[PDB]
Amino acid sequence: DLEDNWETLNDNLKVIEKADNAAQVKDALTKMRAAALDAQKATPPKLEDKSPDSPEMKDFRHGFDILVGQIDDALKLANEGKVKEAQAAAEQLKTTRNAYIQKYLIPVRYLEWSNIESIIAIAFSCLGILVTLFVTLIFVLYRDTPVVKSSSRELCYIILAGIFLGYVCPFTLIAKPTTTSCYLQRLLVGLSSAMCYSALVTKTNRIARILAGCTRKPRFMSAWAQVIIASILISVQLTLVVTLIIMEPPMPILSYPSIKEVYLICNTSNLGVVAPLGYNGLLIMSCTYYAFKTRNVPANFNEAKYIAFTMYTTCIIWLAFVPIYFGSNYKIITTCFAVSLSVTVALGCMFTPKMYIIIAKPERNV
Amino acid sequence: DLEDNWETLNDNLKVIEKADNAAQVKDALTKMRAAALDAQKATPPKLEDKSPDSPEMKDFRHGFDILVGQIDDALKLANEGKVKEAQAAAEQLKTTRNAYIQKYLIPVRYLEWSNIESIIAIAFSCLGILVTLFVTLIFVLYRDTPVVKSSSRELCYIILAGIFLGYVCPFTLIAKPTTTSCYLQRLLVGLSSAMCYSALVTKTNRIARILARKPRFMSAWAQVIIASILISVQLTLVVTLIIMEPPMPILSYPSIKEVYLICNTSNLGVVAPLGYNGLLIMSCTYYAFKTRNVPANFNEAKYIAFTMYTTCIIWLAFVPIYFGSNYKIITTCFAVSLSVTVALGCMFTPKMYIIIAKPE
Numbered sequence: 001d002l003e004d005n006w007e008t009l010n011d012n013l014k015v016i017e018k019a020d021n022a023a024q025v026k027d028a029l030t031k032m033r034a035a036a037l038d039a040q041k042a043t044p045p046k047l048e049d050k051s052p053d054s055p056e057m058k059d060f061r062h063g064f065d066i067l068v069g070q071i072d073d074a075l076k077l078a079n080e081g082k083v084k085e086a087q088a089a090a091e092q093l094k095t096t097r098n099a100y101i102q103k104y105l106i107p108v109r110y111l112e113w114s115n116i117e118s119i120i121a122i123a124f125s126c127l128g129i130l131v132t133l134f135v136t137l138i139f140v141l142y143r144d145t146p147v148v149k150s151s152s153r154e155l156c157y158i159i160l161a162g163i164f165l166g167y168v169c170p171f172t173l174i175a176k177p178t179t180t181s182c183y184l185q186r187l188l189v190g191l192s193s194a195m196c197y198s199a200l201v202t203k204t205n206r207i208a209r210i211l212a213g214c215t216r217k218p219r220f221m222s223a224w225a226q227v228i229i230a231s232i233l234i235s236v237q238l239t240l241v242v243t244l245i246i247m248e249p250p251m252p253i254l255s256y257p258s259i260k261e262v263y264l265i266c267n268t269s270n271l272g273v274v275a276p277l278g279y280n281g282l283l284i285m286s287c288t289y290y291a292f293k294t295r296n297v298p299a300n301f302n303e304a305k306y307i308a309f310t311m312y313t314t315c316i317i318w319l320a321f322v323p324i325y326f327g328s329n330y331k332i333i334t335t336c337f338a339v340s341l342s343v344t345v346a347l348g349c350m351f352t353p354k355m356y357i358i359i360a361k362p363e364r365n366v
Numbered sequence: 367d368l369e370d371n372w373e374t375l376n377d378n379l380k381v382i383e384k385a386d387n388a389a390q391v392k393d394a395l396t397k398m399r400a401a402a403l404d405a406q407k408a409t410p411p412k413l414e415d416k417s418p419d420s421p422e423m424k425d426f427r428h429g430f431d432i433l434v435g436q437i438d439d440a441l442k443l444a445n446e447g448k449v450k451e452a453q454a455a456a457e458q459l460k461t462t463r464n465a466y467i468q469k470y471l472i473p474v475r476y477l478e479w480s481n482i483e484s485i486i487a488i489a490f491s492c493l494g495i496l497v498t499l500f501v502t503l504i505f506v507l508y509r510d511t512p513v514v515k516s517s518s519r520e521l522c523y524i525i526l527a528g529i530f531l532g533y534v535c536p537f538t539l540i541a542k543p544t545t546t547s548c549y550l551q552r553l554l555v556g557l558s559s560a561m562c563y564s565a566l567v568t569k570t571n572r573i574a575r576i577l578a579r580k581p582r583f584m585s586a587w588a589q590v591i592i593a594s595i596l597i598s599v600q601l602t603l604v605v606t607l608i609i610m611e612p613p614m615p616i617l618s619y620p621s622i623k624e625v626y627l628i629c630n631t632s633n634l635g636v637v638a639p640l641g642y643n644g645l646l647i648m649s650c651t652y653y654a655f656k657t658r659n660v661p662a663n664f665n666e667a668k669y670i671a672f673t674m675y676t677t678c679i680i681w682l683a684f685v686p687i688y689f690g691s692n693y694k695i696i697t698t699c700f701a702v703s704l705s706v707t708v709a710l711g712c713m714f715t716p717k718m719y720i721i722i723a724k725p726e
């Protein structure tokens with residue numbers, strides 16, 4: 001029985017605490033190794049319907065591989081004579097029991113796909129991905145047409161890729177926390193927005209520099225210059241997010257905010273959110289400055305007025321996200337809607353007018 | 367404890383079998399009602415992580431609502447004096463335990479999204495839906511262009527609609543059996559293929575009729591109406607079967623040790639719509655072969671002919687694979703996506719290339 005195998009495991013760890021000889025550790029470790037392997041070959045009833053080679057069933061067994069591996073490390077020091085170092089390894093076994101195996105042994109709550117809020121979020125993302133791919137295809141098909149050629153094409157592609165990845169974020173956020181889902185959400189949430197606003201601050205800054213009324217040919221105006229500038233700004237976020245993923249490796253952890261419920265969530269720190277959020281905020285603030293400066297520019301069917309109201313909305317979304325995310329226990333769904341709403345604003349305000357002039361009024365397109 | 371509540375439930379049902387008085391039934395029913403309500407308020411360990419208002423948790427409690435409701439029906443007949451009719455209600459309670467609750471109490475096997483075969487199937491369907499929506503958009507954008515206008519646009523929309531729906535089928539088939547998923551797969555598997563082969567049998571019949579004063583039923587409306595009547599035969603056939611054989615998730619016992627959660631779809635529920643689709647494919651192939659060397663519309667008829675020979679082989683292979691092996695869900699999944707993929711691939715890839723790669 002797996003319920004009694006976990007009892008032998010816990011009671012033998014207590015023997016290490018009150019150990020006053022080498023024989024009281026070696027016996028309690030060998031007995032613990034056999035009790036851990038007996039629990040590994042078992043299946044918890046919440047995984048009884050799952051395939052023996054399902055990701056959860058693989059992760060369940062892997063938790064015991066770490067644990068049995070740690071028992072081998074403790075028996076190495078004990079058989080050597082260094083029983084003092086083997087005694088300290090007992091506390092390392094307790095932390096393993098919580099971070100890899102406990103989630104499979106106690107009732108753990110987490111955000112399901114079944115929840116109305118996550119059904120709305122994923123339904124909205126499917127529409128988002130569909131409309132984004134629709135927009136992208138029209139942009140690609142009407143490549144050489146004067147409506148799309150006149151704007152920064154390569155930069156609009158980065159914006160669309162950022163918007164697309166923005167709609168992918170809820171799938172990684174609503175998915176039951178796994179090392180992979182925790183990795184991807186940190187990467188995708190940080191970079192999706194950074195891609196949009198890195199290309200947008202490049203686009204709007206270029207528009208602000210264009211605002212000038214013999215002369216000299218202006219630099220960093222080229223399509224390649226724009227892509228390079230945007231790429232350096234995105235790479236700042238990529239460096240920031242990846243460095244944090246390295247020093248704070250993504251993991252599913254058990255949170256205890258409620259007195260009765262145990263919640264399975266990602267181990268993402270405040271720093272893991274504030275550092276990339278602050279950089280996205282820096283881009284959104286830079287964007288809005290240039291968007292406002294050029295709000296009344298009538299060039300490209302009042303393209304600038306649409307960027308301006310995209311930016312005022314994004315500012316409000318960002319400003320609302322900080323107290324909602326840091327002041328409430330709705331962190332997953334808040335992130336979901338902050339990303340999906342901010343990217344919908346951009347897709348809607350910035351691309352719907354262009355689509356209209358292309359797929360509904362092609363006489364004004366020429 | 368829910369494990370001991372199910373013990374009281376089973377042992378009191380045994381008392382009804384060996385009952386030789388009205389007192390031995392009334393006591394065993396009241397004791398069973400209290401034991402059922404005690405099990406309903408509980409949570410099985412495979413649902414311990416689930417929200418109390420999750421679909422599984424709701425369906426778990428609903429199984430006891432039927433069961434407690436049945437105990438009320440049996441106590442109605444027992445208190446009346448008709449203990450003979452109340453005794454028969456004990457066998458009706460055993461089925462309720464099986465068809466609605468047992469799946470949450472015993473380890474049950476079913477096809478999960480985690481399986482490599484269903485990962486491939488869903489990955490292939492996502493590409494399918496994407497390519498289908500890509501094709502549809504090009505068809506819609508290049509509406510008035512001579513390549514798409516010369517054809518039956520409205521019928522191609524039916525073909526693509528059926529093809530799209532063909533790729534939607536694996537999502538309903540791989541999803542853990544629920545009443546909804548069982549309804550949707552019967553509807554979608556039957557109608558997806560019927561949409562494709564009704565619009566195609568109409569298209570190819572026309573091509574074959576052209577092979578020869580003004581000919582009738584040649585119009586864009588006539589084609590859509592003819593296709594719609596043929597689809598409605600499948601819709602009538604599938605819905606009538608859904609009515610006389612309501613879709614439900616049930617526990618199958620093909621393996622001596624493994625219990626499977628599957629949809630209660632009968633051989634008839636598969637053979638009747640499969641046979642009609644087979645009739646449509648056979649009719650299609652007849653006309654496709656008859657007009658295999660027609661050079662009109664960039665050898666349009668050649669692509670249909672090959673599409674039809676492949677679809678015949680897929681259908682002919684589906685019957686012994688589906689009826690002769692325990693790979694019924696994944697077989698349906700690939701029979702539908704593969705047959706739809708030949709149509710999308712063979713018939714629409716050249717149409718794209720002659721629009722988006724070779725604009726004359």
Ligand SMILES: CC(C)CCC[C@@H](C)[C@H]1CC[C@H]2[C@@H]3CC=C4C[C@@H](O)CC[C@]4(C)[C@H]3CC[C@]12C
Binds near residue numbers: 122126127421
């Ligand atoms: C283009 C837009 C409008 C389509 C959106 C995609 C739709 C079809 C998807 C996205 C989210 C989906 C839901 C995801 C979660 C659940 C919970 C599950 O237990 C039952 C099905 C249900 C309720 C899904 C049904 C289909 C759904 C509504």
Ligand SMILES: CC(C)CCC[C@@H](C)[C@H]1CC[C@H]2[C@@H]3CC=C4C[C@@H](O)CC[C@]4(C)[C@H]3CC[C@]12C
Binds near residue numbers: 129175
């Ligand atoms: C045309 C486009 C919009 C349709 C494609 C929808 C994509 C986003 C869907 C289709 C099938 C989906 C997967 C189906 C199975 C699972 C199992 C669950 O444990 C985690 C989510 C995961 C991994 C899903 C995530 C989203 C998914 C990849």
Ligand SMILES: CC(C)CCC[C@@H](C)[C@H]1CC[C@H]2[C@@H]3CC=C4C[C@@H](O)CC[C@]4(C)[C@H]3CC[C@]12C
Binds near residue numbers: 122126479
């Ligand atoms: C019309 C098309 C393009 C819509 C997009 C694809 C649909 C079918 C996808 C998108 C997201 C998907 C869902 C995402 C994740 C899960 C969780 C898993 O535990 C059960 C299936 C379920 C609920 C998926 C079923 C299929 C799904 C609803």
Ligand SMILES: CC(C)CCC[C@@H](C)[C@H]1CC[C@H]2[C@@H]3CC=C4C[C@@H](O)CC[C@]4(C)[C@H]3CC[C@]12C
Binds near residue numbers: 176178492
């Ligand atoms: C072209 C479009 C339709 C493809 C987009 C597919 C997206 C939605 C895919 C690509 C990789 C995917 C993820 C791969 C890994 C995991 C970890 C797993 O434990 C839960 C699901 C999750 C988080 C997946 C969900 C869906 C996902 C984010």
Ligand SMILES: CC(C)CCC[C@@H](C)[C@H]1CC[C@H]2[C@@H]3CC=C4C[C@@H](O)CC[C@]4(C)[C@H]3CC[C@]12C
Binds near residue numbers: 479480485488489490
């Ligand atoms: C590129 C085109 C063909 C679209 C492909 C969509 C891809 C990205 C989707 C479709 C189905 C998906 C898978 C559905 C189920 C699972 C099981 C889950 O526990 C881990 C992720 C994994 C393995 C998903 C990864 C992403 C996936 C492979």
Ligand SMILES: CC(C)CCC[C@@H](C)[C@H]1CC[C@H]2[C@@H]3CC=C4C[C@@H](O)CC[C@]4(C)[C@H]3CC[C@]12C
Binds near residue numbers: 537538539542546
């Ligand atoms: C908008 C139109 C044209 C496309 C149809 C949308 C499709 C993709 C949606 C709508 C309703 C959906 C289903 C609703 C119910 C269930 C039952 C559940 O056990 C898992 C998912 C499953 C099987 C869904 C899968 C996706 C689904 C079939």
Ligand SMILES: CC(C)Nc1cc(-c2csc(N(C)C(=O)c3ccc(F)cc3)n2)ncn1
Binds near residue numbers: 185193266276314331
């Ligand atoms: C644990 C999970 C649930 N939470 C997260 C969140 C983040 C994260 C990183 S950056 C960001 N930004 C900028 C916005 O959400 C944002 C962007 C633009 C706006 F207009 C409004 C808001 N969010 N990273 C990791 N984990």
Ligand SMILES: CC(C)Nc1cc(-c2csc(N(C)C(=O)c3ccc(F)cc3)n2)ncn1
Binds near residue numbers: 552631641698701
């Ligand atoms: C129990 C579950 C798993 N199986 C099903 C199957 C059906 C069903 C209805 S019609 C059909 N056809 C025609 C094909 O599958 C078909 C179509 C074209 C081909 F080339 C080959 C085969 N299948 N309906 C409900 N449930």
